[PDB]
Write a protein that binds this ligand. Structure first.
Ligand SMILES: *[C@@H]1O[C@H](CO)[C@@H](O[C@@H]2O[C@H](CO)[C@@H](O[C@@H]3O[C@H](CO[C@H]4O[C@H](CO)[C@@H](O)[C@H](O[C@H]5O[C@H](CO)[C@@H](O)[C@H](O)[C@@H]5O[C@H]5O[C@H](CO)[C@@H](O)[C@H](O)[C@@H]5O)[C@@H]4O)[C@@H](O)[C@H](O[C@H]4O[C@H](CO)[C@@H](O)[C@H](O)[C@@H]4O[C@H]4O[C@H](CO)[C@@H](O)[C@H](O)[C@@H]4O[C@H]4O[C@H](CO)[C@@H](O)[C@H](O)[C@@H]4O)[C@@H]3O)[C@H](O)[C@H]2NC(C)=O)[C@H](O)[C@H]1NC(C)=O
Ligand SMILES: *[C@@H]1O[C@H](CO)[C@@H](O[C@@H]2O[C@H](CO)[C@@H](O[C@@H]3O[C@H](CO[C@H]4O[C@H](CO[C@H]5O[C@H](CO)[C@@H](O)[C@H](O)[C@@H]5O[C@H]5O[C@H](CO)[C@@H](O)[C@H](O)[C@@H]5O)[C@@H](O)[C@H](O[C@H]5O[C@H](CO)[C@@H](O)[C@H](O)[C@@H]5O)[C@@H]4O)[C@@H](O)[C@H](O[C@H]4O[C@H](CO)[C@@H](O)[C@H](O)[C@@H]4O[C@H]4O[C@H](CO)[C@@H](O)[C@H](O)[C@@H]4O)[C@@H]3O)[C@H](O)[C@H]2NC(C)=O)[C@H](O)[C@H]1NC(C)=O
Lengths: 380, 378
């Protein structure tokens, strides 16, 4: 059940797909948390206008309670996100950098056929100081066409963010370092007769001397070489994320130099361990969620009591809760109606310095006229 | 005079430096704007608390004007940032991707010396069907030590964000494509006597037999080869960022396939055009900045006394603003700016003692709680 995604990595292209998919996963987690913060801050702006439009002291106090609750939880969550966000971005960055690296090495290791140039025949020249004949080539090249990664339906099912929850990941798979450092080639030389400096008929891209030079080794004395294949084998390597106990990161830095895969496993381990805590969605808050939130015990005592310093007893909390039900309604439907539905449904319109505003509450408070509408209504 | 940084790109490592430096420039432009938005919202939370602790209705009105002005300008700048942010991030990503690509190619193109394997002596075999001897090698390899980019202080001064304003950038410099696609090598075959399939003494990583084999074709018959040099030479290419008018981006996508360098040029040009406007810093606002901000005309008219503005009305609103916020900047600083860091706020409610300055408290895990306490006393 574990390691479905990493266990499917067998090739440069599938490691690339793993590396990019995991990077986007972490990036998506940061985005979802920040969109949730954005919605919470937009709700607090909406309730700030609604408080400014209340004439009821009790309703006014109810909106102020939601502003105070939302500010506390959203500011706290934004502050809490910063550590995990930076840990997850560090991993995502390295994974995309590794995938780029591999994609470039993939293009070069795909160059598997050589283009021979016209050699020059010689005698005893370095590095063959004991040869009687040498055939010397310069600027042999090997190039492949533009390489692309192509993926099977199985590839995309297994190497998928659905398989990248922290609880199923114990290892990563990487292509071995020689794929990124080493050129590998096969070559063969061939001799015939007595190749010498005179073996200077090159039409066959070799060094043919003096018989009837021509195709294959036509001349009585021929010498040549050919690079017959190039390309380094991509071998796969496994790296563990955790130590024996299953909790600590295995490749913590500071224990000497590390292979690329060891650096990556550490970053992935820490990014998996850095679970983001997404705050409550204010815009879809429910009455029972609100009254059960422990922050609303002290906030309710601040706004809804008449007269507590010390910590609340059981009877004191249940008092605060009934005050909370009075302020916010006794049923969710009332709560939704008077505090949630006004965000999208309540219409606000005004006109001040020659500037007509006609929006609904949440859209207006996230618009260029937002602060002008707050000043207008706090002014009446 | 223009293109100082791109004009210093002469090697793979200086293109890498240029690519990363420009990417960080775009990234730091976004971070500067988003850092301003963060400080603004934290100022607005600070003034929200200062308003709730205010007993004077007129001083309360003043804080609500700062709250309203800040929310208006910060919400607007946040929304305006999103387009340019995405355009600059598109460029920064691609530039970091190119730099990674070029770094990986450099590691491979630095492999300049081969290690031979032990060969196998043959007779005629493909691709040498006429040979009397062949000497066949499998898995010859070329590897460099770990490559780094070493930069001079002149590199870092010329390839620098200070040389990457939009007005000085007309081209980019890139290493030509063959550096990233093509292996280049030199090789030489050597023969002596009559090499045959019996030339199976391989101590020299060549094929020898007869006589006294050993170094430099010591045997009576010998054949072998050596790859004496590897590495493709990196050449530079220039790409223009703008079309003939000098304002619209060249190499726009949707005109057939493009070279890597042309895709990069378009992204850089659009990122250069997508200028980010950083909002006014609320936490360091001066009085003249506040009263002369055009948003404060309507915002003062709404809270300080509202027409639905002549020359006169604008004069009237200005002195209304000086009335609320101060006649001097030292007063405005003292009453509205300095208390964010200098005014300690304390209280006690939920069995929790809380003491902090205003701005720190309104960004702390007790921020909303402090707001409910003071709006509750009021
Ligand atoms: C760092 O270093 C790395 C490593 O070297 C670099 O990474 C490489 O970068 C290159 C260049 O970007 C990559 O190669 C390009 O890949 C493009 C993306 O393709 C994917 O996504 C697109 C969606 O945008 C999708 O269409 C593709 O799927 C197609 O192919 C699969 C596989 O068969 C198939 O399942 C799909 O059905 C699609 O097939 C259609 O299209 C194929 C051609 O693409 C046809 O062969 C097929 O019959 C079918 O029609 C894929 O999922 C891709 O768009 C690029 O292809 C372009 O450009 C090529 C030249 O570069 C050219 O040879 C191709 O023919 C194609 O050109 C055509 O399409 C483009 C885009 O629409 C048009 O602008 C052109 O005008 C042209 O259109 C004609 O042909 C059309 C289709 O035939 C036709 O409709 C139209 O009418 C026209 O006649 C490249 O393949 C490469 O993948 C990367 N490699 C690796 C290993 O990562 C990296 O760049 C570098 N980074 C930096 C910053 O330096
Ligand atoms: C994608 O592919 C990429 C391409 O393949 C790949 O990139 C490569 O990554 C590797 C791995 O990270 C890189 O190698 C590492 O490079 C580190 C940095 O090396 C350079 O800088 C060092 C520090 O010296 C500078 O800074 C000092 C302090 O500020 C100054 O006092 C110096 O004057 C000097 O300043 C100059 O350079 C600064 C940076 O450019 C610059 O800010 C400043 O202005 C000024 O210009 C240098 O020491 C180092 O030089 C070493 O190597 C060069 C080779 O050219 C020699 O000429 C020198 O003689 C010297 O030996 C570079 O200039 C290294 O720190 C790091 O080294 C450690 O690890 C390796 C093994 O991996 C060991 O061999 C080495 O000894 C080090 O190990 C030890 O020390 C550490 C302490 O840090 C210790 O913890 C550890 O236990 C151990 O004891 C390593 O070599 C490589 O550079 C990248 N290459 C390229 C082309 O980019 C990338 O990883 C891939 N990415 C993914 C995701 O896969």
């Amino acid at each position: 059940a574990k390691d479905t995604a990493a266990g499917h990595v067998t090739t440069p292209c599938t490691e690339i797909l793993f590396d990019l998919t995991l990077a986007k996963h972490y990036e998506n987690q940061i985005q979802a948390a920040e969109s949730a913060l954005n919605r919470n801050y937009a709700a607090i702006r909406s309730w700030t206008l609604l408080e400014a439009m209340s004439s009821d002291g009790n309703r006014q106090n109810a909106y102020t309670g939601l502003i105070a609750y939302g500010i506390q939880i959203t500011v706290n969550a934004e502050q809490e996100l910063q550590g995990p966000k930076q840990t997850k971005l560090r991993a995502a960055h390295a994974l995309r950098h590794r995938a780029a690296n591999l994609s470039a090495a993939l293009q070069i290791q795909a160059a598997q056929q050589a283009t021979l140039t016209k050699p020059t025949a010689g005698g005893a020249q370095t590095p063959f100081s004991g040869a009687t004949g040498t055939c010397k080539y310069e600027g042999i090249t090997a190039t492949a066409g533009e390489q692309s990664c192509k993926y099977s339906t199985e590839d995309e099912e297994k190497i998928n963010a659905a398989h990248m929850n922290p609880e199923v990941m114990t290892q990563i798979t990487t292509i071995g370092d020689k794929y990124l450092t080493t050129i590998t080639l096969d070559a063969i030389a061939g001799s015939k007769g007595n190749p010498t400096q005179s073996s200077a008929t090159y039409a066959e891209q070799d060094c043919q001397d003096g018989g009837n030079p021509g195709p294959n080794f036509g001349g009585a004395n021929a010498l040549g070489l050919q690079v017959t294949k190039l390309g380094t084998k991509a071998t796969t390597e496994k790296t563990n994320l955790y130590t024996a106990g299953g909790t600590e990161c295995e490749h913590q830095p500071g224990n000497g130099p590390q292979k690329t895969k060891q650096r990556l496993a550490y970053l992935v381990c820490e990014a998996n361990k850095a679970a983001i805590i997404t705050p409550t969605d204010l815009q879809t808050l429910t009455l029972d969620a609100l009254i059960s939130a422990p922050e609303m015990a002290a906030i309710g005592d601040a706004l809804l009591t008449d007269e507590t310093e010390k910590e609340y007893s059981s009877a004191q909390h249940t008092q605060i809760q009934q005050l909370l039900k009075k302020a916010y309604g006794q049923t969710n439907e009332q709560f939704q109606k008077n505090f949630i539905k006004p965000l999208a449904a309540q219409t606000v319109k005004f006109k001040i310095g020659g500037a007509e505003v006609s929006n609904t509450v949440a859209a207006l408070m996230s618009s260029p006229n937002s602060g002008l509408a707050l000043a207008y209504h706090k002014g009446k």
